[PDB]
Design a protein around this ligand. Structure first.
Ligand SMILES: COc1cc(-c2cc(-c3cccc(O)c3)cnc2N)cc(OC)c1OC
Length: 312
């Protein structure tokens, strides 16, 4: 049932996996490359600081049909008791090119590759946001911690969205909102204005969708900077690099985004390129302070597909 293996089979696969090498370690826990029967899988071990995200992500992938080529493929989840301690495991497909964050730092893009990246992200986010009826379907889902580190680059040049630990869900069946309980907040650098100034409507599901659109505009910016046009390209930078420190505070960000009304600068060279011009316009329409004026994920998907079809 759900998105991955049957529940007893999930226990079996998890116990048989060997961890080969660690590819990420932090306050959150660890990500490892591992192997089941000579096939690479990704194994996340959650730290005790972020156990509630394991529960939320596991409950989601197992009670909902979430299969899409732009959402990280869930395989299994398990609880173990290694030695004088317990461990929470999430297993997914392994993507060897790694996060978009790492990928953007090591390579530049052409028009096709830039668009394949941003279009695949849009498809994944629209698929999350949109409800599917019937017993096959899914509730509407908002992510709440979208950023370049939570997007992986697959081998084919497309990406997938990862980390549903902060997800909220909605159905039109009840008009009911499932927020769960997780003290974790989004990455401060990607927090929308309504979150930073605590005006966000927390009983309205649309609010969370619009927070994702804010954060998606910022990722659009990160990617576009790396598309070459006329021999010119920018260095990789994170959103708001020039006005906040590494690991910025809540107050730092509120000052930048709400008080000073700052938004990512649009390089002027983008205006000589038709694709970058169009992406700059999209970005703007993700960055309105008024959450209700922002574009939807589906609209962004359709707009990127139109831009994709104008490529000669
Ligand atoms: C960010 O969230 C996650 C990402 C990955 C993951 C990471 C890499 C990777 C490998 C090398 C470098 C690099 O930056 C990333 C590859 N495949 C993957 N599936 C796995 C996760 O849970 C199992 C995960 O949390 C949900």
């Amino acid at each position: 049932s759900g998105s991955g293996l049957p529940f007893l089979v999930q226990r079996t696969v998890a116990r048989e996996i060997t961890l080969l090498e660690c590819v990420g370690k932090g306050r959150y826990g660890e990500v490892w490359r591992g192997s089941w029967q000579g096939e690479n899988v990704a194994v996340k071990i959650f730290s005790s600081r972020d156990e509630k995200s394991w529960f939320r992500e596991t409950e989601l992938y197992n009670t909902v049909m979430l299969r899409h080529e732009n959402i990280l493929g869930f395989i299994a989840s398990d609880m173990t008791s290694r030695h004088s301690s317990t461990q929470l495991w999430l297993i997914t497909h392994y993507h060897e090119m790694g996060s978009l964050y790492d990928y953007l730092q090591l390579t530049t893009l052409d028009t096709v590759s830039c668009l394949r990246i941003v279009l695949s992200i849009a498809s994944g986010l629209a698929h999350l946001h949109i409800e599917i009826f019937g017993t096959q379907g899914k509730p509407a889902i908002a992510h709440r911690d979208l950023k370049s580190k939570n997007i992986l680059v697959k081998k084919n040049g497309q990406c997938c969205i990862a980390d549903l630990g902060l997800a909220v869900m909605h159905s039109q069946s009840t008009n009911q909102l499932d927020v769960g309980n997780n003290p974790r907040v989004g990455t401060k650098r990607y927090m929308a204005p309504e979150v930073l100034d605590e005006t966000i409507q927390v009983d309205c599901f649309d609010s969370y969708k619009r927070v994702d659109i804010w954060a998606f505009g910022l990722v659009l910016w990160e990617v576009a900077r790396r598309m070459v046009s006329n021999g010119i390209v920018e260095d990789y930078k994170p959103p708001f690099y020039d006005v906040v420190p590494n690991d910025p505070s809540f107050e730092d960000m509120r000052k930048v985004v709400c008080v000073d009304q700052q938004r990512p600068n649009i390089p002027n060279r983008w205006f000589s390129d038709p694709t970058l011009t169009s992406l700059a316009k999209l970005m703007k329409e993700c960055w309105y302070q008024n959450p209700s004026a922002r574009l939807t994920a589906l609209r962004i998907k359709k707009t990127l597909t139109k831009i994709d079809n104008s490529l000669d």
